[model samples]
Target: FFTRNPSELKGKFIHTKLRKSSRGFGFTVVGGDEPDEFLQIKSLVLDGPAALDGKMETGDVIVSVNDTCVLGHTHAQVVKIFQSIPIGASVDLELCRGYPLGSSAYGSVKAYTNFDAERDALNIETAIKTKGVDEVTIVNILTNRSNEQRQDIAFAYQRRTKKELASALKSALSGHLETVILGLLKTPAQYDASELKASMKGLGTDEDSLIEIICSRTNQELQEINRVYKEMYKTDLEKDIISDTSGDFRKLMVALAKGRRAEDGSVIDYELIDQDARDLYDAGVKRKGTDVPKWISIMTERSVPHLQKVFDRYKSYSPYDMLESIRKEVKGDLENAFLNLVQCIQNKPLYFADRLYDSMKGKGTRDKVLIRIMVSRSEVDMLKIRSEFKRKYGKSLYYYIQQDTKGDYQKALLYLCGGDD
Candidate 1:
């Protein structure tokens, strides 16, 4: 017989093995407490042969199953016990009464998982080759609208679970409909449908659709979908968006999509770095009264290309290379930040390694940003960085780090960067 006071293990649930006695009754040892057992109840499945006798109540301490008592066994031993007992209506669960509270007892309860709807949802997503993002959209849609079933929509104790199942199918039935569905899901479902219609009605707004979708939704929710987009469509979501928009708006967007354009990002392609640097400088440096600082700030940080070709006011048709201009003209922090980007283009690791050497040696006492990046990248692409360092500076970065920082942090940083050093 299974035997333990429910209150004693109130906060803990135990898994255990069962030992069977010849008398058709069993007890499971609460996990780890050998020789201690709790009673198992044998409840017949409703409408089965034994259940037809109708003597069973929800609660009632069950003493036996045909003729055996499972008690005092290891968890593995109990699993073997159940393996022998096949799952069938004939197999009865020996259960116990209400959680045995002082005031009469609450009705006995059973645990079951609602896999029906989840399973169907999984089916639809599997069929479409998608998941969560679309499902979140579907959930939002069904929440606002109800399906028809001449059932006054309510009042009647109608069996609409079947109708609901069908509704779920209808909601998931489209493939191309996915984008609009995603828009509809992200746009608004609880608000008046008229407002939604008003937002889109013959506005001649293809741009509005893109703006509404990209602006309203975080790139995060769409990030995995975006990855799937490239895998399925053969290009990145950002690259596509870049093709679509222009100017300050485009720059703002790319930054938003990338979740913040890093100032000192390592390992980004030099081609893009140079392009961005050049674009920033072109837009400002020669524009007479324009803030060279402000333009430089946006250029290095903002998305400029799409708008660059669209708006030539940033520069005339035949323009100068802004980065080369900045190198010749700018000074101080502005010069430093822009130079960092420019140097990265020529050679990334050597570019960063030089900064590290300057930070720790000669005049400046080790730049934190350079140190953080070097410490961070050491294990990841550090080996590759090592190769780049040698190729550019003709010296190893490991020797530099060895000369600068020391001990466990060094070891941890090196390990993270992929070395035992």
Candidate 2:
């Protein structure tokens, strides 16, 4: 029998020679202290030395530095080694690529090796036929499998039962528990499309959902979501946005829906960054009324890493930070949209943590928000979100879930949560 251990996966080591930029190596690393962790590249600066080298990438595990084996080294030790290298000297970096399952900075779920779709399908069928619809068995099987594996199981179920797995689940379960399971069944893009549809279905639009999905997603994700939205809903995503939203907010959403944001790894023009920062200051804090179009274009079109630099430069010109400037200049949903974008750009996991806290903080739980974030981020960055939750609120997300929800819904959420912080 094959095992699903990620440790058994082997990666090839590649070497790249890079010279230090004026701002150092221009790449950030995460992990090293944990028993199972190695120093992995988190992100690279656009136009910086590491990125310009064009061979290194995010998620590459550092194997050696300048012919010195630095495996199992701590982050501090690695930094010290880099510092020891003389300025303007070239260094050889040996990096191991493509061993980790998910290959992202943070994700709890990894693809299950040797996954058997037929067996899982049969097990799910048996579970559904059991007394009271065997929720424990359902949760155990579904939570352990990655989304890709779940899709295979779903396909196998269709072949066996000649019916949609989602329809079967809808018939068997109800409420939040059902929502979580159904959410798990979708591809990430499908889930996003469905959320957007639900947000605009009724009389009032859930502008928050629109802003969250559109502003947070990458350019490629937005394109996939738009395609899936049209396929699933029989109409263009932009059409839905135009009909459901109005004014500058609608304009912003439609602009974002086009999926034309400057991509990551594109050249970062320092002059443009400074100009964008100055333009934002002049358009908002320095001017009388907000230049809403200028704000919309800049926020919607700039690359995320580029925006990060612009926001940092913005502080030099304005009295208030980006968040404060949005609060001072805009109001209502527009203000909320701007704030959400800025927060997402600055720190995504922290933003999700705040949203999770807001969902569960008070008397009535916003179950949709809780379910959406839990299900969507489960495989993406739920681990980071959990840590950020504890750091920001001084309480575990698990503790809050136990306090706010009950029974199977709580169990499913906890399973997706992976572990306590």
Judged by lDDT, which candidate is best? 2
What lDDT would candidate 2 get against the real structure?
0.86
Indicate the residue-level lDDT of 3 in model 2: 18
Q: Write the per-residue lDDT of candidate 2 for residues 9-102, one digit (tens) a residue.
A: 3677778998886888788887775434577786789878988888887667787888777776667888888888777989899887775533
- TM-score list, all predictions: 0.29, 0.78
Most accurate candidate by TM-score: 2
Give stretches of model 1 more than 4 Å off: 1-322, 341-350, 363-371, 408-421
- The ten-residue window of minimal lDDT in model 1 covers 102-111
User: What's the CA error at residue 311 for candidate 2, in Å?
Assistant: 0.8
Provide the overall lDDT of each model, using Cα atoms, as 2-decimal numbers.
0.39, 0.86
